[PDB]
Amino acid sequence: AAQCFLIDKNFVNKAVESANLTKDDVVLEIGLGKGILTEELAKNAKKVYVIEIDKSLEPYANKLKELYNNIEIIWGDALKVDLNKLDFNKVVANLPYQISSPITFKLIKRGFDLAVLMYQYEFAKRMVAKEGTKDYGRLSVAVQSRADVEIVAKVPPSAFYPKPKVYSAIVKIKPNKGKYHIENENFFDDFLRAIFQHRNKSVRKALIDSSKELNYNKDEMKKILEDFLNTNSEIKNLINEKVFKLSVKDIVNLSNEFYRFLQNR
Structure with a gap:
């Protein structure tokens, strides 16, 4: 049911700030939502691509593109989209939590300067987990071996509407293929x-x-x-x-x- 749009402008700004954007950066966003974050990426980035499955959200895109000339929507399945055909260097997104795992490794495979991604809190704990701890597992190693990761902020359900049952987290990912x-x-x-x-x-x-x-x-x-x-x-x-x-x-x-x-x- 209308599942959990990011609404809290403070957490939008935290994500945008953490992404350290300049006018030379090209950003990929996963999910359009209400277009609140989208607009912030457009303001501060060279260009923003948005991959969105739900075509009924097109009103938000057309209204947004009347204001900004540097937004491009790709209508489709994020897991199906060939990212090799797009040229970007950063990813900033409130992710659909159901595709959390395969989308992380697909993006890492393609490569980026920096990602600032919203995950459910439990998943992020496992991503950043230290050895010998409850949340340390294959996900931790699969990720930390390819990237530097940290939770930049914990995000309460009150930052979303309809508003989730669990906390989320903003996670910063910096691929380091040479570590x-x-x-x-x-x-x-x-x-x-x-x-x-x-x-x-x-x-x-x-x-x-x-x-x-x-x-x-x-x-x-x-x-x-x-x-x-x-x-x-x-x-x-x-x-x-x-x-x-x-x-x-x-x-x-x-x-x-x-x-x-x-x-x-």
Whole structure:
């Protein structure tokens, strides 16, 4: 039902400020809403693209485009839109929470200078979570390995109408493709799926239990792992620590070493 439009001008401004916009910036916004945030991006940016599914919101677009010459609407599914065909450097958005996850990685894949995105509070906690904590998981690592992230503000239900049951959060994302060397990104993705499927088990036991994620059966993985651990380096001894207690740096390092081992096995 009319689900949760951003209305509170203070939280709009907080998002716009956090985005540090200048007239040289081209912004992508996900969702038109009432066009309150849209208007603020138009004021401060070179140009703003808005991907919107709901065509009944067109009145807001036409009224807005009568005032600003630098807004362009793309009518469609954000997950379906080819972002490679658009040239932007920032994303600022009150996201539809249902597409929270696949839209984050799609945007990161395409790349941007900076994103200032609204997520439900719980999801943002997991994005920014530190190792050894309740909210630390695959989402944390998947994100922090590719980007620097922080919650710039917590947002109460009173900032929206109809107004949600939960808090939201404004999250700042700064991609840093160079903070970690990754031997093979696809092997990293598989590794992360395998290990966070057994979050409270040792890395060693997680890998054996979810070996199919890395394209090996259980017995192969047992043997591989024993061969891999026959050399005595420190990082390898961290394979007996519990998955959730390894930091992003520890996971990257361990998977880099595992991949290189497998390459000569």
